[PDB]
C-alpha cells in the first residue's frame, strides 16, 4: 500500500528535479562577474538604545522609519524614537517568554508571541493614553515563533507546530490554515505585493503560501539545516534564506531553485536574522559569532562586518526607506547603523 | 516643536525610571527551567512544593524560600523537538532535570537527554540540578529482583559502591542507586569545564524539601559565578 | 534535499551477523555527527550508538554494547554498522539518524517521533 506510494513521491521528486535541472541556463555568478563590486561597506552605530534587561529575540520597523518595537525575553515591549532615543512606550508582557513581535503598517497595533502560544495585539492608539491588550488569539499548539501584520484587521502567524495561521481582528479566528511543513516554522515574511508570503521551517525547505487561496505554491530545498530566518527581496520577487550550516541561500519564485549560496570557510556559526536593503542589493544577515556580515546579493561578497555587539545577534531589520539598519542582539543593546560619505 | 521635545523627553524619564524600578524586582527572581520525561514525576514535584506560593505550552510556577523568589518553567503542550526552544533559557540559574531511576528502560534516554543539555553551547554556563525521582521505586525494584541492572547496563556487575558514599538500608539498594548517580556524574565530567556543575539529589514521591534543596543549589550557582566574575575560582 | 537511505537488513537467525549501511546525500557526511537510533515493535524509538565527525569519540549503549561496531566513512559518505551474536529482543526497525547541526556535539531531537533528519529505516528480524 504505502510502497506504491513511496514510489510515486520518489519518481515526482525525480522528474521535479530533472525538471529544475535542466531550466538551469546559466549561474548568477557568471552574469554577475562583469558588474562593479560593491567594496568595502564601513558602518558606524549611530545610536544605541539601552534600557532592555533580558535578551532581545525579535526587533521590527515602523512604516514612518522612525518608530522601532523590540522585544526581549524580560517581558517588557518598549517602543523607541529612534531619532531621538527617547522610549515612547513600555508595553508589559504578561508572559515573558517572548519570541517574536511586529509593528503594524498603520502604526494603532503591535504584536508579540511566544512560548506561551499566545498572540497578543496592543491597541497602541487609544484616547486614555495607557497600553491594553485588545485581544488574544489561541488557536496554535507549538511555540509561536513569528507574526506580521497584513493590515488593521489581518494577521498571518507562524507557529513551532508545523502550521501557519491568518488570522482576523475583528472575531479573532483562524480564517486560514496552512499546514504543509514537517519541521517547526521560525520564522515568515510578507512579499510587498501582500498577495502571498513565503515561511521556512525546521526541516531545511521553505514554503510559499498564497493567503486567500490557502494552498502552498512551491517549495525549496538545498539547505543543510533548519531555516531560521526568511525575508523578501524588495521586488517580491525572490526571497533569501538562512540556516544553521553558515550559509545563506538566495531563492527565487520563478526559477523555483536555489540562485547563489553566500558561504565562508572561516565562517561556522548558524544564522538568527536576515534582510534585504531597499535596493536589495545589501543582504544583511545575522550570526552567532558576536556580529553581523553584510553579503553583496550579486556578487557573494562581505561587504562589511557589524561587530559592535558583546552577544549574538537575533534579531535585525531595515528600515522601509533605507535609511538606517538596527541589529539586536542578546546583549540587552540595539545599534543603529549608518555610513557616511 | 519645543513642548513636543519636552513632553517626549519627560515621558522618556518616565519609561526609564519605570525601567529603574522593575530592574530590582527582576534581579530578585531567579528563573528556572524544570526538564524530564513522562515517566518522571515533575508534576508531582511541582505539585508537592507549591505548598511555598508567595493550548498553554509553557506554566508557570513560582514559589519563595527563604525570602526569595524563585519562578520555575515547565513545558507542556509542545512538541517533541526542542532544539529550538531550548535556547530561550539560556539566562536561567539552574536547569532542573528529573530522572526515572526505576525503569532501567528510559535511564539511557534520561542519560542522551543529559547529554543533549550538557554539550548545548548556549546550555553551557547553566547548572543542573539532577532530581533523582522515585528512588522508593527503586528500592523495592531492587529487592525482589525480578529487574536487574546488568542486562541493561553490563558494567554494574563490575561496579564498586564508592567509599564517599553515605548510606541512609540493606548495600544493594544504595549500590544501584548511587551507581545511577555514578553515570551521571561521570557524563557531566566528561566534556563539561567548570564553568557548570552538575548537583545531583535524591527525590521521592512526598519529599517536602525539594525547595530547600534547590535554593542551597542556586545560592552555591551565584556563589561560583560571582568567584568565577572575580576569577578566584 | 537532505534524505537518508538505509541498505541491509533481512531475516537472521539468532546469534548470527549482519552488515547494514546508512547511504546520504545533500550534505557533508564528515561535518555532521550520526547517531544510530532503533524502534522495537510496540515502543518507542531508542538510542543506540553514534559516531563523531572523525570518529575518535565512539559510544554504545549498555545493552549492546561490546556487541555493535559502528564504521565511517568520509570519503563514500556512508555509515555502517555490523552487527553479530545477535538477540531475539533486537529485532526492530534500526533508523539512520543525523545531528540536526554541525561542528556541535550536542544532537538533541536525534529521537524524535517526527524528526526530519533520518531515513525510512530497514526492519531486521531475528528468529529461530
Known amino acids: 500500500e504505502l510502497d506504491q506510494l513511496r514510489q510515486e513521491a520518489e519518481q515526482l521528486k525525480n522528474q521535479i528535479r530533472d525538471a529544475r535541472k535542466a531550466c538551469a541556463d546559466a549561474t548568477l555568478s557568471q552574469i554577475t562577474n562583469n558588474i562593479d563590486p560593491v567594496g568595502r561597506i564601513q558602518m558606524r552605530t549611530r545610536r544605541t538604545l539601552r534600557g532592555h534587561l533580558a535578551k532581545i529575540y525579535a526587533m521590527h520597523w515602523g512604516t514612518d522609519s522612525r518608530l522601532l518595537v523590540s522585544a526581549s525575553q524580560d517581558g517588557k515591549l518598549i517602543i523607541w524614537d529612534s531619532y531621538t532615543t527617547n522610549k515612547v512606550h513600555a508595553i508589559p508582557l504578561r508572559s515573558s517568554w517572548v519570541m517574536t513581535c511586529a509593528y503594524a503598517p498603520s502604526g494603532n497595533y503591535v504584536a508579540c508571541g511566544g512560548l506561551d502560544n499566545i498572540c497578543s495585539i496592543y491597541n497602541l492608539k487609544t484616547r486614555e493614553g495607557n497600553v491594553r491588550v485588545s485581544r488574544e488569539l489561541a488557536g496554535h499548539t507549538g511555540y509561536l515563533s513569528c507574526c506580521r501584520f497584513l493590515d488593521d484587521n489581518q494577521i498571518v502567524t507562524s507557529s513551532g507546530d508545523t502550521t501557519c495561521a491568518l488570522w482576523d481582528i475583528e472575531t479573532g479566528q483562524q480564517t486560514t490554515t496552512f499546514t504543509g511543513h514537517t519541521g517547526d516554522v521560525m520564522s515568515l515574511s510578507l512579499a510587498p505585493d501582500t498577495r502571498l508570503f513565503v515561511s521556512g521551517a525546521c526541516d531545511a525547505s521553505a514554503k510559499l503560501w498564497d493567503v486567500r487561496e490557502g494552498m502552498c505554491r512551491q517549495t525549496f530545498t538545498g539547505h543543510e539545516s533548519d531555516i531560521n530566518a526568511i525575508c523578501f527581496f524588495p521586488n517580491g520577487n525572490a526571497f533569501a534564506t538562512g540556516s544553521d550550516d553558515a550559509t545563506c541561500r538566495l531563492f527565487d519564485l520563478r526559477a523555483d531553485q536555489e540562485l547563489m549560496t553566500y558561504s565562508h570557510d572561516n565562517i561556522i556559526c548558524g544564522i538568527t536574522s536576515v534582510s534585504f536593503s531597499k535596493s536589495g542589493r545589501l543582504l544583511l544577515a545575522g550570526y552567532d559569532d558576536f556580529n553581523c556580515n553584510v553579503w553583496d546579493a550579486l556578487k557573494a561578497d562581505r561587504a562589511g562586518v557589524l561587530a559592535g555587539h558583546d552577544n549574538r545577534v537575533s534579531c535585525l531589520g531595515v528600515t522601509d526607506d533605507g535609511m538606517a539598519v538596527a541589529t539586536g542582539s542578546w546583549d540587552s543593546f540595539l545599534k543603529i547603523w549608518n555610513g557616511s560619505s | 516643536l519645543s513642548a513636543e521635545d519636552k513632553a517626549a523627553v519627560e515621558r522618556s524619564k518616565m519609561i526609564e525610571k519605570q525601567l529603574q524600578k522593575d530592574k530590582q524586582v527582576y534581579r530578585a527572581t531567579h528563573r528556572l527551567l524544570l526538564l524530564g520525561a513522562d515517566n518522571s514525576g515533575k508534576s508531582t514535584i511541582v505539585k508537592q512544593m507549591r505548598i511555598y506560593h508567595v493550548t498553554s505550552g509553557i506554566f508557570e510556577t513560582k514559589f519563595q524560600v527563604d525570602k526569595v523568589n524563585f519562578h520555575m518553567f515547565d513545558v507542556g503542550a509542545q512538541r517533541d523537538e526542542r532544539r529550538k526552544w531550548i535556547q530561550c533559557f539560556n539566562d536561567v540559574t539552574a536547569i532542573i532535570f528529573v530522572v526515572d531511576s526505576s525503569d532501567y528502560n528510559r535511564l539511557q534516554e534520561a542519560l542522551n537527554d543529559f547529554k543533549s543539555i550538557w554539550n548545548n553551547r548556549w546550555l553551557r554556563t547553566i547548572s543542573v540540578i539532577l532530581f533523582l525521582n522515585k528512588q522508593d521505586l527503586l528500592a523495592e525494584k531492587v529487592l525482589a529482583g525480578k529487574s536487574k541492572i546488568e542486562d541493561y547496563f553490563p558494567e554494574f556487575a563490575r561496579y564498586t559502591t564508592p567509599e564517599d558514599a553515605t548510606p541512609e538500608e540493606d548495600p544493594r539498594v544504595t549500590r544501584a542507586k548511587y551507581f545511577i548517580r555514578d553515570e551521571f556524574l561521570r557524563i557531566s565530567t566528561a566534556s563539561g569545564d567548570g564553568r557548570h556543575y552538575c548537583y545531583p539529589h535524591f527525590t521521592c514521591s512526598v519529599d517536602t524539601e525539594n525547595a530547600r534543596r534547590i535554593f542551597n543549589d542556586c545560592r552555591d550557582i551565584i556563589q561560583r559565578m560571582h568567584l568565577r566574575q572575580y576569577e578566584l575560582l | 534535499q537532505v534524505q537518508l537511505q538505509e541498505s541491509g537488513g533481512g531475516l537472521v537467525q539468532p546469534g548470527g551477523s549482519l552488515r547494514l549501511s546508512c547511504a546520504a546525500s545533500?550534505?557533508?557526511?564528515?561535518?555532521?555527527?550520526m547517531n544510530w537510533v532503533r524502534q522495537a515493535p510496540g515502543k518507542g524509538l531508542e538510542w543506540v550508538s553514534d559516531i563523531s565527525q572523525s570518529g575518535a569519540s565512539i559510544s554504545y549503549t549498555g545493552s549492546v554494547k561490546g556487541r555493535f561496531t559502528i564504521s565511517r566513512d568520509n570519503a563514500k559518505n556512508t555509515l555502517y554498522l555490523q552487527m553479530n551474536s545477535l538477540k531475539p529482543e533486537d529485532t526492530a526497525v534500526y533508523y539512520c539518524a543525523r545531528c540536526p547541526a554541525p561542528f556541535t556535539r550536542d544532537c538533541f531531537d536525534v529521537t524524535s517521533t517526527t524528526y526530519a533528519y533520518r531515513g525510512q529505516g530497514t526492519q531486521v528480524t531475528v528468529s529461530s
Open positions: 545533500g550534505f557533508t557526511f564528515s561535518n555532521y555527527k
